[PDB]
């Protein structure tokens, strides 16, 4: 009976592949070849944030383009200000090995996690003034990879146990579980409408899930390596995926297929973090060559390079208004461009 | 300038001073990474070296210097992903029991994957062979032999530079030296002089393991200072 089920599964896969191929009447290049060139963009280090005692691995901008949060392997969370360049708060973490961090849209809670297999949510608007442990979400049999705040009451998290969990800040229990992947989920990316979210995993495929339904509707394939970074388009219909094969891809939620590929014979190092601008004209991507490349999201030509950091570009973030870009590497330096 | 901005700058200076003070305790501690298979006796090591949870931290101070050992037990067989987080550490203590002649190939493959890692090329690996008394008794009784798994055991002689402990049978010495040679053969692969392994023998009731770890870390720090302070 297993053989018949496997044959039916392979037949359905072949059918969906033929369906995705039949809808590919023309590529994006044949349509965008007529657009004006983007030229070159120069970015200079405006602010330099120093004070991290270990290697930086993750950052996140709050609801405003002024505050910033970052994580370091020391176990300390420092709130940075991009304007006056001072340290706001200093949250001491129990586990030093932190790999992800997020800022709530209300500006009241900050989540962190890592190899401790537990998520720590701290409150910044406490009456006592000192930051204390507010929520301790435990139950995951693996290290946390990425976490993002959706609302002021629920938060999704991803672990190495091939399961994603939508916890509730009030009760601290799993409200929705996602067990559709077959490899260690690496990165997450929410939608601007706060109803869907796309996750890139170790199975070289990205899957889109819903907050209420909790079922994967589309499965994108084409990567030949481990997908490590992912970020959705500002409109909410496309998303970029980067792997260690030095080839980034741009998938579409409506077309259900790959649209554009960014690669270069000079770059052989893997991608670590990918993000989009406010309008989505340019695509930022951090590589392991100690640099960060900004290409054109439609023309795939090298628009600019950034060689401010001497170590591996670990984390990259873009503000909500696109006024400044934050780049954090393992050299304990968090640089700001434009 | 407004008063709030000056107070914020003063608080930032205080936080920077606190970070500078924490630098003294963060730089003067050595972070070790304990690795091993499921059958390895690392549990006895961590419970006897006290001189759903994730990372396991053990802080022990010996010879006036402290060590923070980190152990991962709740993770699956996936290792090539999170191991990049364990870079820049002081040492990697890989404990493996040699008494299990059946799963020796798995431990050998694990050690080869750890040594030939792209990110772990700079960090050395301290090799420990635990559970020596059980292996010695099993090879003295003649229940399970080595050549039934590795055909190179018969084509191996006792090295001349061997310095055995007085009061042991030559058979267990030949066996442990063959195991050490087999581990060195895969340890020396792709060495390039950037890192060297430290094969050492240990037991469960053995208590001076801390001294051996301290000496190995001393050698590692000496090599690091020779590579850094322009003397090598």
């Amino acid at each position: 009976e297993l053989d018949q089920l496997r044959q039916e599964a392979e037949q359905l896969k072949n059918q969906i592949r033929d369906a995705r191929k039949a809808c590919a009447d023309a590529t994006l290049s044949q349509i965008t070849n007529n657009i004006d060139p983007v030229g070159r963009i120069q970015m200079r280090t405006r602010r330099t944030l120093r004070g991290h005692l270990a290697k930086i691995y993750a950052m996140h901008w709050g609801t405003d383009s002024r505050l910033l949060v970052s994580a370091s392997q020391d176990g300390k969370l420092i709130i940075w200000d991009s304007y006056t360049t001072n340290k706001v708060h200093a949250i001491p973490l129990r586990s030093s090995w932190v790999m992800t961090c997020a800022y709530a849209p209300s500006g009241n809670y900050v989540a962190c996690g890592g190899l401790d297999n537990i998520c720590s949510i701290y409150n910044l608007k406490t009456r006592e003034g000192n930051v204390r442990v507010s929520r301790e979400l435990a139950g995951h049999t693996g290290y946390l990879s990425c976490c993002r705040f959706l609302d002021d009451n629920q938060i999704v998290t991803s672990s190495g146990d091939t399961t994603c969990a939508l916890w509730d800040i009030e009760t601290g229990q799993q409200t929705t579980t996602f067990t559709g992947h077959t490899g260690d989920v690496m990165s997450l990316s929410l939608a601007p409408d706060t109803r869907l979210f796309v996750s890139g995993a170790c199975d070289a495929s990205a899957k889109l899930w819903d907050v209420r339904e909790g079922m994967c509707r589309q499965t994108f394939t084409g990567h030949e390596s481990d997908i490590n970074a992912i970020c959705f388009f500002p409109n909410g219909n496309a998303f970029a995926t980067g792997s260690d094969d030095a080839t980034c891809r741009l998938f579409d939620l409506r077309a259900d297929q790959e649209l554009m590929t960014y690669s270069h014979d000079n770059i052989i190092c893997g991608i670590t973090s990918v993000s989009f601008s406010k309008s989505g004209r340019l695509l930022l991507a951090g590589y392991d060559d100690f640099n960060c490349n900004v290409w054109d999201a439609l023309k795939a030509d090298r628009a600019g390079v950034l060689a401010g950091h001497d170590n591996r570009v670990s984390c990259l973030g873009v503000t909500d208004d696109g006024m400044a870009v934050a780049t954090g590497s393992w050299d304990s330096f968090l640089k700001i461009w434009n | 300038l407004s008063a709030e901005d000056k107070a914020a700058v003063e608080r930032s200076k205080m936080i920077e001073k606190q970070l500078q003070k924490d630098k003294q305790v963060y730089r003067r501690t050595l972070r070790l990474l304990l690795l091993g298979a499921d059958n390895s006796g690392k549990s006895t090591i961590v419970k006897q070296m006290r001189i759903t949870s994730g990372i396991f931290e053990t802080k022990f101070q010996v010879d006036k210097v402290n060590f923070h050992m980190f152990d991962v037990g709740a993770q699956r067989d996936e290792r090539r992903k999170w191991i990049q987080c364990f870079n820049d550490v002081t040492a990697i203590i890989f404990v493996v029991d040699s008494s299990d002649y059946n799963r020796l190939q798995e431990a050998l493959n694990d050690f080869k994957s750890i040594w030939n890692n792209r990110w772990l090329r700079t960090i050395s690996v301290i090799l420990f062979l635990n559970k020596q008394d059980l292996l010695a008794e099993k090879v003295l009784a003649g229940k399970s032999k080595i050549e039934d798994y590795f055909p190179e055991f018969a084509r191996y002689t006792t090295p001349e530079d061997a310095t055995p402990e007085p009061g042991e049978d030559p058979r267990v010495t030949r066996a442990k030296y063959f195991i050490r040679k087999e581990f060195v053969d895969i340890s020396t692969a792709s060495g390039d002089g950037r890192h060297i392994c430290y094969p050492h023998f240990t037991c469960s009731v053995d208590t001076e393991n801390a001294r051996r770890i301290f000496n190995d870390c001393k050698d590692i720090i000496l090599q690091m200072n020779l590579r850094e302070y322009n003397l090598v």
Partner: single-chain antibody, 230 residues
Framework: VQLVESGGGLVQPGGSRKLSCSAS????????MHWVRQAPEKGLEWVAY????????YYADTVKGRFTISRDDPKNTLFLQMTSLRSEDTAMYYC??????????????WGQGTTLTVSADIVMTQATSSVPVTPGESVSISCRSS???????????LYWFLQRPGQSPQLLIYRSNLASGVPDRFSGSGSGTAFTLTISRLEAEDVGVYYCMQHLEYPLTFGAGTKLEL
């Protein structure tokens, strides 16, 4: 949080007195402290200010040199040494906490204070000293400043306090921005020289005196105070 002050009594002019203030329930080391004196049937006046770690300590122009203030972080205490007391030093002293960061609320909690009976600056003026108003209708209070409180960064430094009869003052507005625990009925709007505080519906618990404070320089100055008759 809780602030307990002690040290009041009958002191003759020219003596010395050590007022003590114990804090309990919050991080006293991270919060800067301020002293505010209030005379019987008069306005408020800033006495002194101390920062975290005693790195920034400042006094008012009328008490510079005579009075001093110190803090003890291990014991979590604040001490105020007042020497060579004058005949006008009879007043009630309040010790208040304030933290400075982006999105903070300085002067959020007001202590209980202790009474003591002995024997340029931006002066804040209020054209409406007493407005007898019926509960249920909106209240509009005006405030005029002699110097532009709008700094180059674009932030407006102005604080509103509501001192109820027989109770400690409460912070209503710290920056347009509403303070924590304060209902949304209060609002503030105006330019860099004129400000208006609007209350949509006044209730029986909203009775009190409204004081305004500027925070552009270190020597803070309070207003005359606007009281409302229930």
């Amino acid at each position: 949080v809780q602030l307990v002050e002690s040290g009041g009594g009958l002191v003759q002019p020219g003596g010395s007195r050590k007022l003590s203030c114990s804090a309990s329930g919050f991080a006293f080391s991270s919060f800067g402290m301020h002293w505010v004196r209030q005379a019987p049937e008069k306005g408020l006046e800033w006495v002194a200010y101390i920062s975290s770690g005693s790195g920034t300590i400042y006094y008012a122009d009328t008490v510079k040199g005579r009075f001093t203030i110190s803090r003890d972080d291990p014991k979590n205490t604040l001490f105020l040494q007042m020497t060579s007391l004058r005949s006008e030093d009879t007043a009630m002293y309040y010790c208040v906490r304030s933290i400075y960061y982006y999105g903070s609320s300085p002067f959020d909690f007001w202590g209980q204070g202790t009474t003591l009976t002995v024997s340029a600056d931006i002066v804040m003026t209020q054209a409406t000293s007493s407005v007898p108003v019926t509960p249920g209708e909106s209240v509009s209070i005006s405030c005029r400043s002699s110097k532009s409180l709008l700094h180059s960064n674009g932030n407006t430094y102005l604080y509103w306090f509501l001192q109820r009869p027989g109770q400690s003052p409460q912070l209503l507005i710290y920056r347009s921005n509403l303070a924590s625990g304060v209902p949304d009925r209060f609002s503030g709007s105006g330019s860099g020289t004129a400000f208006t505080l609007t209350i949509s519906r006044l209730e029986a618990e909203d009775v009190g005196v409204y004081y305004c404070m500027q925070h552009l320089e270190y020597p803070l100055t309070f207003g005359a105070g606007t009281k409302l008759e229930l």
